[PDB]
Nucleic acid binder design. Structure first.
Ligand code: B12
Ligand code: SF4
Ligand code: SF4
Length: 379
RNA sequence: GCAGACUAUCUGC
């Protein structure tokens, strides 16, 4: 009966393109609770987590008289067909794989809405669904439901699809039989830990999110200097601890057409981003997950990417931004970039902007830019 | 009306 409904749910889930489905109880996540507290006391959380720990670990608080949680996963593509080439004059930035195609929040919610209506259409079933923006830890739910195991890079990693999956889940009042957690396949490997550009993976399965490039790309303020050279040409997110992972070798699934990257926005030219209108940003980037904080972090990161490529051809546009952009973070990061690119011809204009800039943080960035030129010109 | 900022409000033309 419940066994029967489970069988049907699984069947239906697959038919609407869910790539993996699991079941667990609505029992409290005791281990997670301790973990969240530890991470918090260490200053290792990101701040994107639901702040109420009671709600994060207690399904029955979220859904009264809850009995189970249904976990779903969808595999997303890891290779971009016909990626454009980033040339000396036409430099590009890159969005992480989790921001290719239609925002996964929309895709996975659509599927959960269907799973919910499936159950409602039967019987007194009650549900509460979430993807990423709900109170639960999606990874904790998926681990306990047998979707994948918790690898050393913190990713839920599946045998079929690797770590390249979007997670979502649905709390119900249906006493489904739970599944069994699956085996840890990392063994003695430490490739992700050694590859991480900032050492954010401080121990296996432990992230200092404050040092993680994926977090850093999404911040709205000034990027701390020690990361300005580690971010490379990343505009949003970071994939290094997954792409380097042996468990992901060969894993390039194209099962969902709306997840297919549009190469011109997944790997966009940097210079046009510096001047994009809001209307144009909304039209081009508005349906990818990477636009959820608007265009400012993206534009800040594109400035850093151009400094990274030392693109002297961006120096006039950067000079205009340093002067004209209404945002202190953009004027300041542009001034730093001008100094970083290392064309002594712009030293004078930095000196002149310093005397005109009123914002103290931006003034400081112009001073750093001036300093960068002074040091590099004397080499 | 347009453009911008901030995450409805604010600011210009
Ligand atoms: C905040 C946030 C982040 C933060 C912090 C990530 C992190 N590792 O904590 C930042 C902004 C850095 C980030 C980055 C990314 N994230 Co993110 N993020 C989230 C969010 C909203 C909550 C994460 C969270 O609560 N972390 C806190 C830690 C403490 O818990 P947890 O990871 O959720 O759960 C595990 C640990 O607690 C661990 N644990 C528990 N007890 C113990 C005990 C011991 C001893 C140990 C060692 C471990 C351990 O086991 C749990 C289950 O795996 C979730 C969505 C959600 N609501 O859950 C997405 C989510 C984790 N992110 C996701 C993605 C795709 C990413 C990126 C790959 C995006 C990118 N390409 O840049 C990177 C990967 C970074 C990484 N190596 O982990 C997916 C992961 C899917 C998957 N297959 O695992 C999620 C689930 C979103 C989704 N629904 O698809 N993210
Ligand atoms: S996402 Fe990038 S910065 Fe963050 S842990 Fe993985 S490799 Fe390190
Ligand atoms: S790189 Fe190695 S240790 Fe890290 S998640 Fe992959 S298999 Fe596990």
């Amino acid at each position: 009966n419940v066994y029967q409904l489970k069988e049907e749910l699984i069947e239906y889930a697959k038919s609407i393109g869910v790539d993996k489905i699991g079941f667990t109880t609505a029992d409290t996540f005791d281990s997670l609770k301790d973990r969240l507290i530890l991470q918090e006391s260490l200053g290792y959380l990101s701040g994107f987590e639901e702040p109420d720990i009671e709600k994060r670990v207690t399904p029955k608080l979220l859904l009264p008289k809850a009995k189970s949680i249904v976990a779903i996963a969808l595999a997303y593509p890891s290779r971009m067909k016909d990626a454009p080439r980033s040339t000396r004059t036409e430099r590009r930035g890159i969005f992480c794989r989790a921001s290719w195609g239609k925002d996964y929040h929309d895709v996975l919610r659509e599927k959960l809405d269907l799973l919910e209506d499936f159950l409602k259409s039967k019987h007194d079933i009650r549900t509460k669904s979430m993807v990423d923006t709900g109170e639960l830890s999606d990874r904790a739910v998926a681990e306990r439901a047998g979707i994948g195991f918790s690898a050393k890079n913190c990713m839920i990693t599946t045998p079929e699809y690797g770590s390249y999956v979007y997670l979502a889940e649905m709390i119900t009042n249906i006493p489904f039989e739970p599944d069994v957690p699956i085996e840890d396949m990392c063994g003695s490997c430490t490739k992700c830990l050694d590859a991480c550009p900032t050492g954010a993976l401080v121990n296996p399965g432990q992230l200092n999110a404050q040092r993680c490039i994926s977090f850093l790309t999404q911040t709205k303020g000034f990027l701390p200097d020690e990361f300005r050279t580690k971010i490379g040409n990343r505009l949003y997110g970071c994939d290094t601890c997954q792409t380097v992972c042996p468990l992901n070798k060969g894993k390039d699934f194209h099962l969902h057409p709306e997840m297919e990257p549009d190469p011109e926005i997944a790997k966009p030219l940097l210079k046009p981003l510096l001047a994009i209108s809001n209307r144009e940003f909304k039209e081009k980037f508005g349906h990818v997950s990477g636009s959820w904080r608007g265009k400012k972090p993206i534009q800040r990161n594109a400035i850093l990417a151009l400094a990274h490529f030392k693109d002297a051809s961006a120096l006039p546009e950067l000079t205009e931004l340093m002067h004209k952009d209404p945002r202190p973070v953009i004027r300041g990061t542009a001034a730093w970039a001008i100094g970083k690119i290392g064309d002594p011809a712009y030293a004078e204009e930095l000196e002149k902007a310093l005397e005109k800039e009123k914002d103290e943080e931006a003034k400081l960035e112009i001073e750093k830019g001036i300093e960068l030129l002074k040091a590099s010109g004397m080499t």
